[PDB]
Amino acid sequence: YLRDGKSNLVSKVVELHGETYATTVKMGLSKTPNTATSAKVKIDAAYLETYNKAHNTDFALYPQDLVTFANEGILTVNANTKSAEVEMTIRAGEGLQEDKTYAIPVAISDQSSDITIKDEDAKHCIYLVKDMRNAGDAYKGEGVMQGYLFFEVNDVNPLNTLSFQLENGKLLWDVVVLFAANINYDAEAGRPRVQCNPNVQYLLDNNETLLQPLRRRGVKVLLGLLGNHDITGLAQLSEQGAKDFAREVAQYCKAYNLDGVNYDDEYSNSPDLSNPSLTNPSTAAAARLCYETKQAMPDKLVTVFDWGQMYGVATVDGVDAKEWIDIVVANYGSAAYPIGQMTKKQCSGISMEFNLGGGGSLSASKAQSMIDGGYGWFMGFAPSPAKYGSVFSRLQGGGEVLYGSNVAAPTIFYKKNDPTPYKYPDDL
Numbered sequence: 493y494l495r496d497g498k499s500n501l502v503s504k505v506v507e508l509h510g511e512t513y514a515t516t517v518k519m520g521l522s523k524t525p526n527t528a529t530s531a532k533v534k535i536d537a538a539y540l541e542t543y544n545k546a547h548n549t550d551f552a553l554y555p556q557d558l559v560t561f562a563n564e565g566i567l568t569v570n571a572n573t574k575s576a577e578v579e580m581t582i583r584a585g586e587g588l589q590e591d592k593t594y595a596i597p598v599a600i601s602d603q604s605s606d607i608t609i610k611d612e613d614a615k616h617c618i619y620l621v622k623d624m625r626n627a628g629d630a631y632k633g634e635g636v637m638q639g640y641l642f643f644e645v646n647d648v649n650p651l652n653t654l655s656f657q658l659e660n661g662k663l664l665w666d667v668v669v670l671f672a673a674n675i676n677y678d679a680e681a682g683r684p685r686v687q688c689n690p691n692v693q694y695l696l697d698n699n700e701t702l703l704q705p706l707r708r709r710g711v712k713v714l715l716g717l718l719g720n721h722d723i724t725g726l727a728q729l730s731e732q733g734a735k736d737f738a739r740e741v742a743q744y745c746k747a748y749n750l751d752g753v754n755y756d757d758e759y760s761n762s763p764d765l766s767n768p769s770l771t772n773p774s775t776a777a778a779a780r781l782c783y784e785t786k787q788a789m790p791d792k793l794v795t796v797f798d799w800g801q802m803y804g805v806a807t808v809d810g811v812d813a814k815e816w817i818d819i820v821v822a823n824y825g826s827a828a829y830p831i832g833q834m835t836k837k838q839c840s841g842i843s844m845e846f847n848l849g850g851g852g853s854l855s856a857s858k859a860q861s862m863i864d865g866g867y868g869w870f871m872g873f874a875p876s877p878a879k880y881g882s883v884f885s886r887l888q889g890g891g892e893v894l895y896g897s898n899v900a901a902p903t904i905f906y907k908k909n910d911p912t913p914y915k916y917p918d919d920l
């Protein structure tokens with residue numbers, strides 16, 4: 493089969509932060525090659541219609557003139573690694589649209605008889621390309637650790653993400669979660685639904701002013717989903733129930749122009765096993781939902797809190813978790829761990845409970861330990877302007893290690909449901 497060589501993913505999201513992006517396309521080999529092993533790759537524009545139909549997506553084709561393969565797309569065989577690869581360059585173009593995902597479907601062609609291609613799936617990989625050159629204010633560089641922040645939107649305006657910058661002006665928090673919409677039972681439909689409390693609903697209704705300004709500066713905004721004290725839950729949907737709920741989550745992220753989801757399996761009660769949308773609570777059911785959610789929004793982030801039964805099964809329908817868990821964050825005091833072919837670049841190395849105090853600090857020591865451990869993420873939960881003294885104290889020193897620039901003292905904060913930047917601390 494064919495995949496992206498750097499990530500080893502068959503579906504790879506590419507964020508352009510500069511004028512070019514370089515990678516390889518890699519064909520895996522089933523036998524040690526010989527002098528005759530050969531293959532080429534090409535862009536397969538016709539396959540995009542098939543892909544979009546299968547995923548209920550609408551991606552446009554990235555301009556083919558902006559994509560270049562080395563060596564006319566002929567793959568260089570590496571006999572020692574059972575693979576063959578070609579360099580591919582993606583150039584940023586003109587006349588592209590901000591905030592639109594484009595597709596580069598790549599196909600194997602002209603392969604030698606020693607290569608067996610099982611199906612059309614193994615014959616293709618896909619790059620999902622986003623131009624992020626202008627939504628650059630959270631982008632702190634190649635290979636740095638990234639931040640993941642939950643807001644308790646019952647109480648705190650997520651525009652407070654903008655209170656957190658390094659001295660070099662970059663935004664600290666790459667990803668923020670609106671915590672949380674709920675899963676609840678819909679009796680009229682006999683199935684689960686997304687249920688948004690009035691605070692969540694107000695944010696979505698007002699996404700233009702209270703959420704999209706974060707996305708304009710490059711922050712990914714995710715909808716949090718959380719159990720909510722009835723028979724439905726994120727780790728207890730049947731295969732069919734998970735397919736249906738995943739489509740609803742994807743519809744929210746499309747309707748409100750968000751960047752994905754966090755799943756937190758807490759507070760559900762026991763399921764009604766006679767209901768066909770439900771099943772025994774388990775990590776396999778949770779993994780099924782994550783997989784189906786990714787199939788429904790392959791260019792958006794599927795992330796989990798490692799608690800309850802939400803995380804741990806590493807394959808669904810033969811597909812490894814690297815393809816459908818983008819980020820896993822752990823409980824306060826723990827580091828997350830990868831499953832399947834994930835690496836610790838998908839995992840949090842610290843989780844900080846900013847409202848109650850546990851989980852430690854993003855100190856210089858801790859930052860270096862996390863880098864040394866290969867972690868990709870640091871997580872924080874429930875910051876608020878009233879506690880900025882404590883929150884920012886727990887961020888002292890780490891930024892110099894992670895980025896060469898410490899977190900700056902806050903000077904602005906936002907009040908709930910109010911777009912006005914107030915002066916910190918004078919305005920409270």
Ligand SMILES: CC(=O)N[C@@H]1[C@@H](O)[C@H](O[C@@H]2O[C@H](CO[C@H]3O[C@H](CO[C@H]4O[C@H](CO)[C@@H](O)[C@H](O)[C@@H]4O)[C@@H](O)[C@H](O[C@H]4O[C@H](CO)[C@@H](O)[C@H](O)[C@@H]4O)[C@@H]3O)[C@@H](O)[C@H](O[C@H]3O[C@H](CO)[C@@H](O)[C@H](O)[C@@H]3O)[C@@H]2O)[C@@H](CO)O[C@H]1O
Binds near residue numbers: 642671718719759797
């Ligand atoms: C990523 C992560 O940290 N995940 C979790 C967090 O959930 C947890 O946060 C804390 O969670 C507790 C428990 O919240 C759940 O239970 C609440 C109480 O439910 C019961 O009572 C209700 C009546 O008061 C009944 O209606 C209900 O049926 C049940 O009998 C419940 O109110 C809460 O749901 C609300 O909040 C969530 C978002 O948090 C929202 O989706 C719901 O729609 C609803 O609005 C949960 O079901 C909670 O008590 C903690 O709350 C305190 O702290 C927060 C700030 O963090 C304050 O805003 C709040 O005022 C309280 O002071 C907090 O939310 C964290 C930390 O423990 O850890 C992981 O477990």
Ligand SMILES: [Ca+2]
Binds near residue numbers: 625626
């Ligand atoms: Ca800009």
Ligand SMILES: [Ca+2]
């Ligand atoms: Ca808790």
